[PDB]
């Protein structure tokens, strides 16, 4: 629908002007906006008008003419056929979703990866639409790679549902029920879309709204609806403020504000980590944080993979240890002595990111510089890093043993250095065929490489931790190595879980390279404390193990 | 935006007013001589445009 004023067009014919060749671009932008509003040229394919939304609906009417199992076959307040199709803890999950719907406040659900977070919610939405006679609207937010999934399940289990992709669609609100979008797309569409008041709002990647100050979380928060839900892939990973933000999005009035939470609802000394009037160490902080955990339990669901997926071969927490070379030790001591300029210099390559310098010394002292090309002809040199020697030993052992090994690395500079090492520096490793991955790899190429790895003839698959979410399926792996502490424990779980998807019959041994006496061990201790906090807020065990943060917090700096 | 308590909002307003005032004129005949991190008084626009060697 080209509504551009023909007046300017005939003026242009009167006297054409090429300087306004951007006016066509502005017109294209306006036409795109009008498409997202009430029009669409070639975007019907994105689960919009012309698809099962309003065209292929007849394909389902003959089996059930607008009367699904929720209405015709074993009609109840809930569907009958899906529940028979549903497995254990899934029917109960949908039942509790129904309870929350009666509560008309919201909720948060999520099971250990691979247990079907995407499923058990589409069925509930369809149940509300048909058995509950829910006219909608219903909203979904997730990455496009997962949006295609959501659409696939929607059109598979419940064809009649009118679902669409808010990536490059049109019509949408102009037409009648379900909408899926990207979080970045949600940011882009700060227009009326936020005022639609989507009756059933559900967010897929709750882990992407952990930070209260993050623009994604606040953008979701402005969209207030009587029923807002989160499907966080994982629970708390870094701070209880993340749980506060999640609960505020789903249940604003049922929990205190940010202050009340931070000064009180904090497992550390804030809530009385020594609630039993014991040492200031956080070891007896119970009956207060446990109370909050029990208060939130009526609002969260969790199924452990072991609950139904007992077929999960042994996991190995084999923390390797390395030795700092004389060159590395000398550079480490030099930096430590010269680090103190303002003693933190607000971090800035001294403490906060002086950790980066320490890590670079630990891993690639040979090429410790941005201008690596000057040293590239002669470096890297594994002699300056015993961690490279350990990696070589393990890779050779697994190659002679024919194990598909996964290598997890830090910023792509280390990735490329390791690639060059294995490919050319050491002929022993050159005999091993390898694969590569990075954050700049194309999505199609990423999928192709993942498929190759699952059935690879190669030996080593070098991978970066950050690239890709939990969807990356690397069940073909037989061995895993972690090159350095991957900060947030969630990253470590994802890395070790690249092999551990639904399947992975062959046992996989996971290794974590470490340097004895270095700051890396201190970072690992910090990660262990984070895991302990997660366990405390999740299961509330009587764990008295507690690293002495009162001095170790400053010790971990350097 | 977050509905902070009254006194916190008042303190933030006073701080903003003080920074703006010092920016235009960093000599208010008062106690708070705004000064840089390095320990030097901020050169307000008034200081630039004032006195000998003072832009006029």
């Amino acid at each position: 629908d080209d509504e551009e004023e023909e007046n300017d067009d005939k003026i242009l014919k009167e006297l054409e002007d090429l300087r306004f060749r951007g006016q066509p671009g502005e017109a294209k932008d306006d036409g795109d906006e009008l498409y997202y509003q009430e029009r669409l040229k070639k975007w019907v394919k994105q689960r919009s008008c012309g698809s099962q939304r309003s065209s292929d609906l007849p394909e389902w009417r003959r089996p059930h003419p607008n009367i699904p199992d929720a209405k015709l076959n074993s009609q109840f307040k809930i569907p009958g056929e899906i529940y028979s199709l549903l497995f254990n803890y899934q029917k109960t999950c949908v039942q509790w979703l129904y309870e929350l719907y009666q509560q008309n406040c919201g909720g948060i659900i999520g099971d250990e990866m691979g247990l079907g977070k995407t499923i058990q919610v589409i069925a509930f939405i369809a149940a509300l639409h048909h058995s509950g006679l829910l006219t909608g609207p219903v909203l979904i937010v997730c990455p496009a790679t997962v949006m295609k999934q959501w659409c696939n399940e929607f059109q598979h289990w419940w064809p009649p549902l009118r679902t669409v992709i808010l990536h490059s669609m049109g019509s949408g609100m102009a037409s009648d029920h379900i909408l899926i979008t990207t979080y970045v797309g949600l940011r882009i569409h700060s227009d009326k879309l936020l005022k639609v008041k989507w009756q059933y709002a559900v967010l897929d990647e709750g882990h992407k709204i952990r930070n209260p100050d993050s623009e994604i979380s606040l953008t979701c928060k402005k969209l207030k609806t009587h029923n807002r839900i989160i499907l966080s892939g994982t629970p708390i990973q870094n701070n209880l403020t993340e749980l506060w933000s999640l609960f505020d999005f789903i249940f604003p009035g049922k929990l205190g504000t940010l202050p009340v939470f931070q000064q009180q609802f904090v497992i550390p000394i804030n809530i009385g980590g020594y609630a039993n009037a014991t040492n200031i160490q956080v070891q007896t902080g119970y009956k207060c944080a446990v109370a909050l955990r029990d208060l939130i339990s009526p609002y969260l669901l969790r199924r452990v993979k072991a609950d139904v997926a007992k077929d999960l071969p042994q996991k190995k927490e084999m923390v390797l240890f390395c030795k700092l070379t004389k060159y590395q030790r000398s550079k480490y001591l030099e930096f430590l002595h010269s680090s103190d300029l303002n003693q933190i210099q607000n971090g800035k390559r001294n403490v906060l990111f002086g950790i980066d310098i320490l890590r670079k010394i630990c891993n690639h002292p040979d090429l410790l510089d941005r201008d690596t090309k000057r040293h590239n002809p002669d470096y890297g040199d594994p002699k300056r890093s015993g961690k490279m020697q350990v990696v070589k030993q393990l890779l050779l052992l697994w190659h002679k043993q024919g194990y598909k090994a996964l290598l997890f690395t830090q910023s792509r500079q280390m990735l490329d250095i390791l690639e060059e090492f294995i490919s050319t520096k050491d002929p022993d490793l050159s005999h091993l065929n390898y694969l590569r991955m990075d954050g700049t790899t194309n999505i199609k190429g990423r999928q192709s490489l993942v498929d190759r790895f699952n059935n690879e003839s190669f030996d080593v698959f070098l991978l970066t931790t950050r690239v890709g979410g939990l969807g990356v399926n690397l069940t073909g792996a037989n061995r895993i190595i972690i090159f350095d502490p991957d900060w947030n424990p969630s990253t470590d779980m994802q890395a070790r879980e690249r092999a551990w998807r639904i399947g992975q019959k062959r046992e996989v041994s996971i290794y974590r390279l470490m340097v004895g006496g270095s700051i890396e061990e201190k970072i690992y201790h910090r990660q262990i404390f984070k895991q302990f906090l997660t366990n405390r807020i999740l299961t509330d065990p009587k764990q008295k193990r507690f690293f002495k943060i009162h001095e170790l917090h400053d010790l971990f700096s350097l | 935006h977050n509905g902070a308590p009254h006194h916190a909002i008042e303190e933030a307003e006073s701080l903003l007013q003080f920074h703006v005032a010092t920016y235009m004129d960093n000599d208010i005949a008062g106690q708070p001589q705004a000064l840089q991190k390095s320990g030097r008084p901020v050169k307000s626009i008034r200081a630039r445009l004032k006195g000998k060697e003072g832009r006029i």
């Binding site: 004023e5 023909e6 007046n7 005939k10 003026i11 014919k13 | -």
Partner: protein
């Protein structure tokens, strides 16, 4: 609308051009720089009057430069349109994208919404013409245009028009 207005333009003059022929050069320079000029203040400068009787006052030497700056006074003929004003223009072209008419130095423009509701475009007519209504408007005919807007360009001044009403029909 055609009317006569006074003009006052400042002319600089390089010292090397000072001489007995100065007045003639001033007149030449202004007539070439002003006649037919485009101005948003006065639309189109159509004619400079009293070319024989020109009051140039006579100007002054710039302080640090020897050049002289002259303020020449004039009576001039100019043309500008008005919103809500009717012009008996002459047609130039017809198209389904709209209708435009010529008014001396300016071309009037008419929108889809400013023709009569019964005046659709007939592309089959040679030349293309508005044969839909009882009043056939051809490319080479004449028509009254009802102005509702002035379009300003640096290189030219344009305006819009309407032919909705009966009194706005072809001449």
């Amino acid at each position: 609308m055609f009317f006569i207005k006074d003009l006052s333009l400042n002319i600089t003059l390089h010292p090397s051009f000072f001489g007995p022929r100065m007045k003639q050069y001033l007149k030449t320079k202004l007539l070439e720089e002003v006649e037919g000029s485009c101005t948003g203040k006065f639309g189109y400068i159509l004619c400079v009057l009293d070319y024989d009787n020109i009051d140039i006052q006579r100007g002054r030497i710039l302080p640090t430069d020897g050049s002289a700056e002259f303020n020449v006074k004039y009576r001039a003929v100019v043309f500008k349109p008005f919103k809500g004003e009717v012009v008996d223009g002459t047609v130039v072209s017809c198209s389904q994208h709209g209708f435009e008419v010529q008014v001396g130095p300016m071309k009037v423009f008419v929108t889809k919404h400013l023709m009569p509701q019964d005046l659709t475009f007939n592309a089959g007519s040679n030349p293309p013409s508005y044969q839909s209504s009882e009043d056939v408007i051809t490319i080479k005919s004449r028509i009254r245009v009802k102005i509702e807007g002035c379009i300003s360009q640096v290189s030219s001044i344009h305006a819009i028009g309407s032919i909705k009403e009966d009194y706005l029909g072809a001449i």
